[PDB]
């Protein structure tokens with residue numbers, strides 16, 4: 001129902017789990033280059049992924065290009081530096097949820113230009129540093145989908 | 157705040173992500189043997205895990221042993237065969253959330269003896285088969301923690 005954006009993702013396995021997640025939820029995936037792997041990389045193919053789970057994915061050469069072609073109504077940045085928690089905001093159609101790379105998170109140059117209410121954190125206990133990227137995306141996507149009533153889900 | 161139970165988990169990487177998840181959330185982890193890896197396996201150590209993230213983990217030789225030593229107040233089984241969704245139930249202290257193996261899910265012999273209201277599914281779109289185990293656990297744990305007010309979380 002919403003759009004998920006990975007800013008310069010590095011590890012193919014995480015992205016593979018995220019593509020499966022987006023196909024299982026109906027969320028659309030955007031990737032902002034440079035990526036840490038070839039798009040034709042095995043770690044997304046031999047991985048167990050179905051080719052139909054791809055192609056609904058948009059790749060953007062730069063962040064600027066992404067903003068200019070998508071014109072997100074609202075852009076959220078998931079960052080352990082955020083103040084409101086992911087479940088304390090009210091998602092709406094038109095929202096884009098952006099995540100940073102596994103080894104460094106979203107650039108301060110980008111975060112600096114975003115409103116405080118749109119930089120959100122997933123809660124963690126003391127001395128936690130961050131969570132695995134694919135797990136962060138799963139938690140965020142499912143919290144948004146829960147708020148939006150799980151439109152599109154079907155019983156098996 | 158709650159207890160997470162992995163029934164015969166097979167792949168070390170998933171369990172590694174789950175141990176990091178439980179340490180980041182304060183949830184307690186239980187593993188029901190046989191596991192698919194040695195407890196002394198590298199895929200949980202060279203993985204980037206901190207030894208303190210372990211030892212709060214309980215290993216059980218059998219499911220029966222687990223029931224007899226833990227006496228869960230309520231035991232939930234996460235299964236794509238469940239009717240209520242994970243966010244449609246009201247978690248409470250004392251709950252144990254159980255997940256099945258990556259290649260087969262929880263045995264019907266166990267599911268058959270559980271009440272319908274305690275076999276829960278995470279929603280998915282048409283023709284979805286299941287989600288990655290560590291992602292399923294993350295989504296469930298964070299939904300429960302959200303309901304319980306994120307007790308124990310701290311801002312970084």
Ligand SMILES: Nc1ncnc2c1ncn2[C@@H]1O[C@H](CSCC[C@H](N)C(=O)O)[C@@H](O)[C@H]1O
Pocket residue numbers: 077078079080098099100101102103104105106120121122123124129130131132133136
């Ligand atoms: N607790 C949390 N809250 C919000 N986003 C999180 C998160 N844990 C991981 N993420 C997301 O997962 C991405 C990859 S984890 C990146 C490492 C992190 N920047 C660090 O300095 O340790 C992050 O950029 C973010 O989008």
Ligand SMILES: Nc1ncnc2c1ncn2[C@@H]1O[C@H](CSCC[C@H](N)C(=O)O)[C@@H](O)[C@H]1O
Pocket residue numbers: 233234235236254255256257258259260261262276277278279280285286287288289292
């Ligand atoms: N949509 C969903 N709802 C509930 N639990 C799920 C799930 N997707 C994965 N899981 C959990 O992740 C575990 C490993 S996935 C296991 C494969 C699945 N039994 C199959 O037949 O395809 C499952 O046993 C369950 O505990």
